[PDB]
Amino acid sequence: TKSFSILLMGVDTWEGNSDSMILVTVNPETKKTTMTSLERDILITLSGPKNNDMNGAEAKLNAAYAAGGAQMAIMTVQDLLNITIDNYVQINMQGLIDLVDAVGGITVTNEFDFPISIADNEPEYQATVAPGTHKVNGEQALVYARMRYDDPEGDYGRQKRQREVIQKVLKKILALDSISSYRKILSAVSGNMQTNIEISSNTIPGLLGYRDALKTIKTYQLKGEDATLSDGGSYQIVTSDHLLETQNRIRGELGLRKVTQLKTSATVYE
């Protein structure tokens, strides 16, 4: 019954590439969970083992994972937000499909006037989401989550959608009453999910002591301005203003002191 922080990472497979970085704050006391999406494109100074060539390099946040696995991603995001992160959870795409299936599916709304597909690009995922509101399986949930319009305005939507999927999966998990139910869900994702959190017969029930925090899930996005790179690629500097409100929002939920200055490994305009 204490507030804790977890860094959620989707990974194309445990070395591979970060497809998502969500900081989740769980407060059982306030009965509130916050999910803040961190832009893969933010420019930042990476933090890793000193053993590592990329420790100290200024790069996009996406690159922490690519250089030193989940260890570097945590070190890097710790220095981005000036808060200590208690645990991490990597899931890959098979993971995400298995999990959505294991909770009985979810309901999403395709806002557009055309079905959503990604097979043209990635033919391993031939699923599709009709327009309107429909119950969706794991294969259809991944596709909704991974669809990028490949526009400067692509991730923003992709990130809202990724958050949605997780939130909806989490609402299904609240409504579970059995420990077996939960045991079956950790079975379902066994191969395709990895974490600091201890998984045993000891912990599956210890976990249900936090379900109360799923009663209110507020979603958020850390953002700034889209700029250009010499290769023609795209990055984003964080407006120091937006950055602090973000460290303070999270710190609050995690039961901590509001900060006065802005200590960050990130590259602000100033």
Author numbering: 57 to 69, 78 to 334
Cite, word for word, the article reporting this structure:
The LytR-CpsA-Psr (LCP) (LytR - autolysin regulator; CpsA–capsule-associated protein A and Psr–penicillin-binding protein regulator) is a family of enzymes responsible for the last step of the assembly of WTA and other cell wall glycopolymers. LytR and other members of the LCP family have been described as pyrophosphatases. They cleave the pyrophosphate bond in glycopolymers precursors. In this work, we studied the LytR protein from the Gram-positive bacterium Streptococcus dysgalactiae subsp. dysgalactiae (SDSD), a known animal pathogen and one of the leading causes of bovine mastitis and fish streptococcosis.
In this study, the structure of the LCP domain of LytR protein from S. dysgalactiae subsp. dysgalactiae was determined at 2.80 Å, confirming that despite low sequence homology with other LCP-family members, the overall structure is highly conserved. Analysis of the electron density maps suggests the presence of three sulphate ions at the surface of the protein. No electron density was observed at the active site that could correspond to bound substrates. The regions S48-Q56, G70-Q77, and N335-S342 are highly disordered, with no interpretable electron density in the 2Fo-Fc map. The structure is composed of 8 α-helices alternated with 12 β-sheets in a 3-layer (αβα) sandwich architecture. The characteristic central six-stranded β-sheet is sandwiched between the α-helices and the double-stranded antiparallel β-sheets (β4-β5, β7-β8 and β11-β12). LytR LCP domain contains a long and narrow pocket located between the central β-strand and the α-helices 3 to 7, near the N-terminus. The presence of this pocket is extremely conserved in the LCP family of proteins corresponding to the binding site of the undecaprenyl units - the hydrophobic section - of the physiological substrates. The binding site of LCP proteins is composed of conserved positive and negatively charged residues: two aspartates (D68 and D83 for SDSD LytR) coordinate the Mg2+ cofactor and are present in all members of the family identified so far, except for just two cases. The positive charges come from four conserved arginines (R154, R210, R212 and R222 for SDSD LytR) that are expected to interact with the pyrophosphate group present in the native substrates.
